[PDB]
Design a protein around this nucleic acid. Structure first.
Ligand SMILES: [Mg+2]
Ligand SMILES: [Mg+2]
Ligand SMILES: [Mg+2]
Ligand SMILES: [Mg+2]
Ligand SMILES: [Mg+2]
Ligand SMILES: [Mg+2]
Ligand SMILES: [Mg+2]
Ligand SMILES: [Mg+2]
Ligand SMILES: [Mg+2]
Ligand SMILES: [Mg+2]
Ligand SMILES: [Mg+2]
Ligand SMILES: [Mg+2]
Ligand SMILES: [Mg+2]
Ligand SMILES: [Mg+2]
Ligand SMILES: [Mg+2]
Ligand SMILES: [Mg+2]
Ligand SMILES: [Mg+2]
Ligand SMILES: [Mg+2]
Ligand SMILES: [Mg+2]
Ligand SMILES: [Mg+2]
Ligand SMILES: [Mg+2]
Ligand SMILES: [Mg+2]
Ligand SMILES: [Mg+2]
Ligand SMILES: [Mg+2]
Ligand SMILES: [Mg+2]
Ligand SMILES: [Mg+2]
Ligand SMILES: [Mg+2]
Ligand SMILES: [Mg+2]
Ligand SMILES: [Mg+2]
Ligand SMILES: [Mg+2]
Ligand SMILES: [Mg+2]
Ligand SMILES: [Mg+2]
Ligand SMILES: [Mg+2]
Ligand SMILES: [Mg+2]
Ligand SMILES: [Mg+2]
Ligand SMILES: [Mg+2]
Ligand SMILES: [Mg+2]
Ligand SMILES: [Mg+2]
Ligand SMILES: [Mg+2]
Ligand SMILES: [Mg+2]
Ligand SMILES: [Mg+2]
Ligand SMILES: [Mg+2]
Ligand SMILES: [Mg+2]
Ligand SMILES: [Mg+2]
Ligand SMILES: [Mg+2]
Ligand SMILES: [Mg+2]
Ligand SMILES: [Mg+2]
Ligand SMILES: [Mg+2]
Ligand SMILES: [Mg+2]
Ligand SMILES: [Mg+2]
Ligand SMILES: [Mg+2]
Ligand SMILES: [Mg+2]
Ligand SMILES: [Mg+2]
Ligand SMILES: [Mg+2]
Ligand SMILES: [Mg+2]
Ligand SMILES: [Mg+2]
Ligand SMILES: [Mg+2]
Ligand SMILES: [Mg+2]
Ligand SMILES: [Mg+2]
Ligand SMILES: [Mg+2]
Ligand SMILES: [Mg+2]
Ligand SMILES: [Mg+2]
Ligand SMILES: [Mg+2]
Ligand SMILES: [Mg+2]
Ligand SMILES: [Mg+2]
Ligand SMILES: [Mg+2]
Ligand SMILES: [Mg+2]
Ligand SMILES: [Mg+2]
Ligand SMILES: [Mg+2]
Lengths: 46, 122, 393, 240, 159
RNA sequence: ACCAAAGCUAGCUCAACAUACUAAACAAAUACAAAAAUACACCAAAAUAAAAUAAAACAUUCACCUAACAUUAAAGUAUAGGA
RNA sequence: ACGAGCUACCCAUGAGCAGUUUAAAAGAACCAACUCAUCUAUGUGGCAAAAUAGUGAGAAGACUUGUAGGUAGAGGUGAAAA
RNA sequence: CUCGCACACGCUUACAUCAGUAACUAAUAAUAUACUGAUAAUUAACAACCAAUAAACCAAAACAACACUAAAACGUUUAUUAAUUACAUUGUUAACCCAACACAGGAGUGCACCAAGGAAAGAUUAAAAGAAGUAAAAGGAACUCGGCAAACACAAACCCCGCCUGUUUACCAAAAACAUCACCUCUAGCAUUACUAGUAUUAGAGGCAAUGCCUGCCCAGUGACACCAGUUUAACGGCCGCGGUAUUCUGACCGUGCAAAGGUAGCAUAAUCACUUGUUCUCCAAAUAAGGACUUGUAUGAAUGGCCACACGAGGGUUUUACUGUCUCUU
RNA sequence: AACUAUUCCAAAAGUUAAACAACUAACUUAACAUGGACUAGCAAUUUCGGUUGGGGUGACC
């Protein structure tokens, strides 16, 4: 009906989807971390 | 958009999220669900009697400093093992097999405080 | 045969061992040196781990056969929670016992004497029912787990109040959760009734035998019913580690040595977690029997003999709305043979203390049709209850 | 991702065991089978489909069991019976008139004289008369029953040749088996299961059946009334 | 792994195509290793064994690049070791058989230091060399004691 | 007269050289939901680059296009190509 | 590569449905909470990148809803509206 | 005037005390829960963390007496071992979250309907037009595409289409579209991850839409079975003419051509090319509307279903009553 | 093309006679599974010549 509230916060969902452990379990994720490390990001992951 | 930067802490999550602030565990969970403390895991402060002794938190200003010599393995070898070794080689009683009389320890696993895997905090 | 695991579930078979382990006289090179997995190197094989000092909690479970009490004879145990498939039939056969419909006439005479009633019976018992079923809790409709023990204890108190008139009742003491182990051998099958019942009323002085000799000798001629396809052991616990010693929950020199009444509550909310009335009857048969057998081997001894002095024990049981009354007379310590004198049991079954209960007024078309309280009340069942409590005096 | 199947329990129990439906999804999570999901919640009763199953390997002989109760099953169309003998109970598929408090024989023994067939009776095929009605039919001896388990179905023993039975499946196809294989004698329970009338779409949903698609497909060549000569006879007999 | 034209007309579609070797399960007997291995081989492998006149022959007589298998190289490392060692455990009961077999392969015999490094991946090699080089660093009490004995014997010999 | 305006520094760019090539900083904590001392396991893996585009369309083809061998010529020659 | 914290459909696991009418918790009836979104008027850089006011439909069911999981773009999902 | 207190989730100090506010936040001020600074603070009993392995148990929750069908969440006991020893660790503020905002929107649960929470108006004036409301003489749909909206009304009838409750295009379509009980075709003779721990009264792939009466003729083409023959239409799809005849219009009959069969029953100016505002009757003072009949519709028509019917519908049409500022004609 | 099923030849494992007449061939095939074909399914890539008293239809080139 009205839109834009699409983000409904959960810490569990957040850290399961985007968390450090999640990024490190697949080789693709590890490449994500690696890219951000390269670009010098302050936060590599959630 | 949540918070990425701020550090993750027990204050942040759900009820199910409990993460200590880094104190060390003193025990385990027992039968009744009640928690059991092991007297051995709780640090026992060893405190000497301070009353009868003379030293203070500060030093007199006119008292001199000294030439700064960092203690080396060598100097410590010379203040302890060197007099005894020279004494027993000059007497011909020196035994290259057992050095244990001079204070050398072959292995660390016997004694209470071991140096290499480092059994004691402080 | 259709096997019941599923390959997908069962713990995955070990990875096929590295090819370098097939070559004779060759030392494989493994990552075991660097203390962590590396690709490019062969998988190390390790000895089953032996932490030279054993830790009580984290050790592997000791295999059962290592126990000191281990025996090769399978012993069938009956504990508090076992259901018998054929309840009273099996119970009887394991107990070598004949069944009689009513209660002993001693008890009925004890029950029908107008002297033996409380002050106002209907008033007090309707109150104990209302209390247990409604008033004892803060909630609208209390569960069975609370109200069954509450009603049995309420009735125990209504009876206990009679200690004024017959002051022999002070010779009793109540006990909760005693170890009971009664081992006996029946027809090449080893049986042990072992466990805890809920509540046990003990007396200082024993109970007078309730069957005339005509009944005992008429019991000598009775043929035990048999269920052919079903083994009589069905529903018990096959057990390879057990002790054979006669044990009643008390040590030597116990001031109240003689078991009087056993109380069995069924407090569980769900139907399937309660006993069928029949299985309950079985339960209290076998447990009454063990309780008796214990004494019988204390006052006489392990020798198997017919008894010149019969032991008598009682038992009551409950839905909390439904009561099972039992009196047991143990005449025999030799159950090995089928052919001798049989023990006796009187069972008054399915005695309703009340029909139904309403904790809220039931309302139809905006009027009050049925008020709050019990529907129907049998003073009879409480009368029998009182009798069985009064059997000593 | 990966899901584990609920179908892991090693030891047989008569007690109902809890199970997880998965509407049509394979272990990857994709839809394999369409139109399945969300029925009533169900427990599962383990059924022993090997009818001849000696309790102990010590006494091999033909044994007899009592029927305790006959209960509805959520998992299959037939009604099932709780059956106890010796120290053991099991769920078996109930034959049409099987009732509580009953006696049922399980036998591996053939003989020259055949047998007068009751309902709950399980016999090897070779031991039966040649016109008998059979259900719960093994394929290879020692395998366990697969064929003819559905509600109110019955096959028929057709003939016996060369130490081998030839039977007629409910689809009216013929099946060749060793005569050493066990079958139960009779029609399976609940014969009116055919004539049940689902009243409302809701009722279908209770059975865990999601509606068909709304997409309109034109009928193809596969459609029409095809009259095919009945298929050749399946033989599970392995020739030397 | 490659591409192909359909019909072999250059003017047709160009299509990715991969040609796979036909594999067989075959058990082979090694003389020097006295064992039967169940191995997946090709018909080309069998023809090469045939052509080199023995299994063990084919494995000793072929260079690393031509076998292409880590397993072939481990087989070879094994029987090469068994040849340089003259390992008695080959045929424990019969020195006749043993000398007989060790005889025909005498052309390939290499010293021992070479023989254990033959079939190794660079990883396995680096590991091996790390293990031969493994030493718990020597206590400074030892070294200081030897310096002291040197000085004391040179103080004893100067007078 | 307001709003404004002016600096010349911070550093950068491109090469040269060069040793050789994952800087600095590690007390504790860090792959539980990274930064949470402490319990019986599992662990791990590879398959051709494609297309936009050029051919005035598009179908075979289309340099370079994350594979060390540079430089002066031979030579835009021999050859290859819906030639 | 990243996305199913919105939405489609599932899986686990919880939670709600008062009064009235009926032999009945019958995808019955009246009507709240609840869920939808009929018709009109407002509003149209608005309170709002879909709302407000009235009015409506369902309201023990193919019902609503919380939490945790799944399916991924040559795909998924779909009581087909591409 | 009334969305109140708490918890979960989520937010993270925005909370508290003192002081300050020229300017910065508040869409203005006054001053301050929101701007500034300094100083403090939520204390476990609630909550999180908080055993395995064998063994007996077929018996729903619904006030549970006992049952219904869709067959149902939730544990006892017995045995074997479970470090045994005060005080462990962590959540405790708020006026808060998702919507770029101090947003009339979105937000689970338990109790409350007030005892708790709050303020529609910065100050005036009382022009037009606009919004929201209350009332209205006589009339009562004459308004209008339509009784849209409104009403002191809150009733009855008849058609079309869909059987029904349900579902759908989040943000222009809620329907006659989809699904659906039922009926039908096809395809399968079977074992450890789907179907399915199932086994042809079963399971998939579809079609059509309950019920009732029915579902006519066609296998030549195109499919699909049968690897060719041959079989199949509740498979894709098809189901005709010209001439001569009863005094006369018609044509039972006659001739002949072509087809695989030549459109059967029914219904019909239809939601059905055009002709079309077909023709007639009823309804109205008056009707291209509505209903009823006639009806070649040469382009209806039988599970791409044909015909009747109950009940149902925020579906689309028509009548009557009543009601009314829709309108006469505005105040 | 790939892939999914079908059918076939070859590959691979085998098996039989010592074959027939007078004075070498033939057959076999459990699951995998390769090379080359066949028939379908599911698909992949690519394109909609121009003129035209606007385009389309017709006409033309
Ligand atoms: Mg957004
Ligand atoms: Mg962010
Ligand atoms: Mg927390
Ligand atoms: Mg919280
Ligand atoms: Mg404590
Ligand atoms: Mg099912
Ligand atoms: Mg059933
Ligand atoms: Mg269907
Ligand atoms: Mg359809
Ligand atoms: Mg181009
Ligand atoms: Mg160009
Ligand atoms: Mg182009
Ligand atoms: Mg390219
Ligand atoms: Mg050429
Ligand atoms: Mg979700
Ligand atoms: Mg209600
Ligand atoms: Mg309803
Ligand atoms: Mg509204
Ligand atoms: Mg209004
Ligand atoms: Mg409303
Ligand atoms: Mg309503
Ligand atoms: Mg309604
Ligand atoms: Mg998810
Ligand atoms: Mg494309
Ligand atoms: Mg798609
Ligand atoms: Mg459509
Ligand atoms: Mg924020
Ligand atoms: Mg403040
Ligand atoms: Mg301000
Ligand atoms: Mg609070
Ligand atoms: Mg104002
Ligand atoms: Mg005005
Ligand atoms: Mg107005
Ligand atoms: Mg008005
Ligand atoms: Mg008026
Ligand atoms: Mg008009
Ligand atoms: Mg007009
Ligand atoms: Mg209206
Ligand atoms: Mg009206
Ligand atoms: Mg009206
Ligand atoms: Mg409808
Ligand atoms: Mg939907
Ligand atoms: Mg819409
Ligand atoms: Mg919607
Ligand atoms: Mg609607
Ligand atoms: Mg709409
Ligand atoms: Mg439809
Ligand atoms: Mg029909
Ligand atoms: Mg119909
Ligand atoms: Mg037809
Ligand atoms: Mg045809
Ligand atoms: Mg034909
Ligand atoms: Mg008509
Ligand atoms: Mg028309
Ligand atoms: Mg037509
Ligand atoms: Mg059709
Ligand atoms: Mg049509
Ligand atoms: Mg109806
Ligand atoms: Mg509607
Ligand atoms: Mg209507
Ligand atoms: Mg509707
Ligand atoms: Mg006026
Ligand atoms: Mg295409
Ligand atoms: Mg191309
Ligand atoms: Mg063109
Ligand atoms: Mg043009
Ligand atoms: Mg033109
Ligand atoms: Mg023009
Ligand atoms: Mg043209």
């Amino acid at each position: 009906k009205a839109r834009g509230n699409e983000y409904q916060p959960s810490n569990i969902k957040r850290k399961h989807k985007h968390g450090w452990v999640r990024r490190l379990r697949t080789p693709t994720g590890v490449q994500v971390i690696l890219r951000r490390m390269h670009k010098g990001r302050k936060s590599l992951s959630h | 958009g949540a918070d990425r930067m701020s550090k993750w802490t027990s204050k942040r999550g759900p009820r199910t999220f409990c993460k200590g602030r880094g104190a060390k565990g003193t025990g385990f969970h027992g039968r009744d669900g009640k928690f059991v403390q092991i007297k051995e895991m709780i640090p026992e402060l060893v405190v000497p009697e301070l009353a009868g002794f003379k030293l203070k938190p500060y030093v007199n200003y006119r008292a001199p400093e000294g030439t700064d010599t960092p203690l080396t393995a060598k100097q410590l070898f010379l203040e302890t093992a060197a007099p005894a070794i020279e004494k027993d080689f000059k007497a011909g009683t020196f035994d290259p097999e057992h050095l244990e009389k001079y204070g050398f320890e072959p292995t660390q696993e016997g004694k209470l405080f071991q140096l290499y895997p480092k059994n004691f905090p402080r | 045969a259709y096997e019941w695991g599923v390959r997908s579930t069962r713990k995955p078979e070990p990875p096929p061992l590295d090819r370098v382990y097939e070559i004779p006289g060759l030392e494989p090179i493994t990552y075991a040196g660097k203390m962590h997995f590396m690709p490019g190197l062969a998988r190390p094989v390790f000895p089953p781990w032996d932490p030279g000092w054993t830790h009580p909690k984290f050790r592997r479970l000791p295999p059962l056969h290592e126990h000191p009490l281990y025996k090769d004879q399978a012993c069938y145990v009956f504990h508090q929670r076992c259901r018998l498939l054929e309840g009273v039939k099996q119970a009887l056969w394991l107990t070598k016992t004949q069944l009689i419909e009513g209660l002993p006439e001693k008890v009925l005479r004890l029950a029908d004497d107008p002297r033996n009633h409380i002050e106002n019976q209907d008033e007090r018992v309707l109150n104990a029912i209302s209390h247990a079923r409604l008033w004892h809790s803060t909630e609208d409709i209390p569960k069975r787990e609370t109200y069954c023990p509450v009603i049995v204890d309420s009735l125990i108190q209504l009876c206990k109040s009679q200690i004024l008139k017959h002051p022999s009742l002070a010779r009793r003491i109540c006990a909760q959760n005693n170890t009971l182990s009664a081992t006996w051998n029946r027809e090449s099958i080893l049986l042990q009734v072992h466990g805890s019942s809920g509540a046990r009323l003990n007396a200082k002085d024993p109970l007078p035998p309730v069957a005339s000799q005509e009944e005992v000798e008429a019991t000598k001629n009775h043929v035990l019913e048999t269920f052919y396809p079903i083994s009589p052991t069905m529903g018990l616990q096959e057990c390879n580690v057990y002790d054979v010693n006669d044990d009643t929950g008390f040590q030597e020199g116990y001031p109240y040595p003689c078991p009087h009444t056993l109380y069995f509550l069924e407090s569980a909310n769900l139907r399937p977690r309660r006993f069928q009335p029949d299985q309950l009857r079985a339960k209290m048969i076998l447990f009454a029997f063990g309780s008796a057998l214990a004494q019988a081997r204390l006052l006489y001894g392990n020798d198997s003999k017919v008894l010149e002095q019969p032991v008598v024990v009682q038992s009551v049981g409950t839905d909390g709305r439904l009561f099972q009354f039992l009196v047991l007379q143990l005449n025999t310590t030799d159950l090995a043979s089928d052919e001798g004198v049989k023990n006796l049991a009187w069972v008054d079954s399915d005695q309703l203390l009340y029909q139904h209960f309403w904790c809220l007024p039931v309302i139809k078309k905006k009027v009050v049709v049925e008020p709050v309280g019990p529907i129907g009340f049998q003073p009879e069942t409480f009368r029998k209850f009182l009798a069985l409590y009064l059997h000593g005096a | 991702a990966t899901s584990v199947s609920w179908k892991s329990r090693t030891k047989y129990t008569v007690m109902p065991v809890k199970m997880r439906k998965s509407g049509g999804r394979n272990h990857t999570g994709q839809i394999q089978v369409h139109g399945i999901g969300g029925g009533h919640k169900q427990r599962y009763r383990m059924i022993d489909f090997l009818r001849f199953r000696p309790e102990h390997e010590s006494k091999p002989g033909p044994f007899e069991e009592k029927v305790i109760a006959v209960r509805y099953d959520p998992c299959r169309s037939a009604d099932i019976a709780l059956v106890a003998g010796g120290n053991r109970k099991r769920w078996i598929i109930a034959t049409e008139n099987m009732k509580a408090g009953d006696t049922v024989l399980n036998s591996d023994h053939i003989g020259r004289m055949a047998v007068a067939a009751r309902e709950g009776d399980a016999h090897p095929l070779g031991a039966l008369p040649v016109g008998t009605l059979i259900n719960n039919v093994e394929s290879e001896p020692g395998r366990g029953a697969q064929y003819i388990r559905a509600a109110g179905t019955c096959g028929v023993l057709l003939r016996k040749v060369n130490g081998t039975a030839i039977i007629q499946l409910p689809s009216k196809r013929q099946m060749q088996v060793l005569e050493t294989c066990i079958a139960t004698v009779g029609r399976v329970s609940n014969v009116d299961h055919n004539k049940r009338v689902i009243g409302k779409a809701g009722r279908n949903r209770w059975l865990g059946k999601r509606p068909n698609s709304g997409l309109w497909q034109r009928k193809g060549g596969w459609a029409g009334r095809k009259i095919r000569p009945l298929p050749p006879m399946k033989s599970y007999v392995k020739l030397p | 792994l490659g591409h192909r034209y359909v019909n072999n007309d250059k003017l047709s579609k160009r299509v990715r195509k991969v040609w796979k070797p036909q594999l067989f399960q075959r058990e082979l007997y090694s003389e020097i290793l006295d064992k039967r291995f169940t191995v997946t081989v090709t018909m080309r492998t069998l023809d090469l064994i045939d052509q080199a006149c023995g299994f063990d022959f084919y494995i000793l007589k072929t260079p690393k690049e031509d076998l292409c298998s880590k397993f072939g190289m481990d087989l070879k490392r094994g029987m090469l070791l068994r040849l340089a060692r003259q390992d008695p455990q080959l045929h424990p009961d019969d020195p006749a058989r043993r000398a007989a077999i060790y005889d025909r392969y005498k052309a390939f015999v290499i010293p021992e230091a070479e023989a254990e490094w033959v079939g190794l991946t660079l990883d396995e090699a680096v590991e091996k060399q790390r293990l031969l080089e493994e030493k718990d660093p020597i206590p400074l009490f030892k070294i200081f004691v030897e310096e002291l004995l040197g000085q004391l014997q040179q103080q004893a010999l100067s007078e």
